[PDB]
Ligand binder design. Structure first.
Ligand SMILES: *[C@@H]1O[C@H](CO)[C@@H](O)[C@H](O)[C@H]1NC(C)=O
Ligand SMILES: *[C@@H]1O[C@H](CO)[C@@H](O)[C@H](O)[C@H]1NC(C)=O
Ligand SMILES: [K+]
Length: 301
């Protein structure tokens, strides 16, 4: 596994870009029962930061513990199509499953829209996260394709928090091997697959193994935002699992971190970042997993 302790600071434009995706991910918690996103795109404070955005479709499946909910929208101001995904089930229930239950690792080429030749032969991923990816594809994939055809020069951006972040990573990989050029930003994302998968994802997105991911740049298309004290990005840890590169770490205990305290981390594990979370920092598992620029997991704040 490529390890490092190198980190780099960011500028305010990059901080505002990460905050943006944190907000869009938060809005994913406005989909489901008891909540709503009103057309065009109204859902209280967080949707109010998105003029000229129209909700296309929401989706919600509660059938299985790894099923997903979320929405598809088009932002005519930024010329982007947004796919935003979350886990349908409570964060407590989902994280308990990921933390404690041992998935058999499955080849990503078994997932929807992935051809037998698109992945490396050793590209293995947690069977639950494949289900989250599949469940996203089966609910929204055809609608996303029709919207891509309708707005063919808009940039596709996939984002999600928690299990949504795992589904987003895989859905971005689906779009990328299938000829699109998506932006993928995940928050609080658990480790998806093994060393084969992680290194293949780094080649796919950064163009080499052990990529220099110290910079935010117009052409970079993968960011994994993590927060001090959140253990979700540290599980599952069954040896075998490892992250791809691309970590952006909020080294701050609260929402709304100072600019100095969001850093770009080198490597697939970095003790200056998530891998260095101390035992006292890890204690409050759900609360620390919500603190990503804005509070994630609750609609309307
Ligand atoms: C994913 O969904 C497709 C239907 O689009 C199905 O063919 C496939 O077997 C599913 N894969 C897994 C691992 O569930
Ligand atoms: C599925 O793959 C096809 C064939 O490459 C691609 O054209 C299409 O956009 C993909 N659809 C989704 C929703 O990923
Ligand atoms: K990963």
């Amino acid at each position: 596994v490529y390890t490092s302790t190198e980190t780099s600071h960011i500028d305010q434009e990059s901080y505002n870009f990460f905050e943006k995706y944190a907000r869009l991910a938060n809005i994913g918690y406005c989909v489901g029962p008891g909540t709503k996103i009103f057309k065009p795109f109204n859902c209280g404070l967080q949707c109010a930061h998105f003029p000229n955005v129209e909700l296309i479709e929401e989706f919600h499946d509660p059938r299985l513990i790894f099923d997903v909910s979320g929405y598809l929208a088009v932002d005519h101001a930024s010329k982007q199509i947004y796919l935003v995904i979350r886990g349908t089930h409570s964060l407590e229930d989902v994280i308990t499953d990921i933390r404690i239950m041992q998935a058999p690792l499955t080849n990503f080429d078994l997932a929807a829209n992935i051809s037998s030749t698109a992945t490396c032969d050793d590209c293995l991923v947690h069977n639950g996260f494949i289900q989250s990816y599949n469940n996203t594809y089966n609910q929204i994939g055809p609608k996303l394709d029709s919207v891509i055809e309708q707005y063919p020069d808009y940039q596709i951006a996939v984002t999600g928090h928690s299990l949504g972040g795992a589904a987003a990573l895989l859905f971005g990989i689906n779009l990328k091997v299938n000829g699109h050029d998506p932006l993928v930003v995940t928050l609080g994302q658990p480790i998806v697959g093994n060393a084969g998968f992680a290194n293949w994802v780094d080649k796919l997105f950064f163009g080499q193994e052990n990529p220099d991911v110290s910079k935010v740049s117009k052409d970079r298309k993968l960011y994994r935002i993590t927060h001090r004290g959140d253990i979700v990005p540290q599980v599952p840890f069954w040896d075998g699992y490892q992250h791809c590169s691309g970590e952006v770490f909020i080294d701050w205990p609260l929402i709304h971190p100072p600019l100095s305290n969001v850093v770009m981390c080198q490597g697939q594990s970095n003790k200056q970042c998530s891998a260095g979370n101390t035992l006292l920092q890890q204690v409050n598992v759900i609360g620390n997993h919500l603190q990503y620029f804005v509070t994630e997991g609750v609609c309307g704040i």
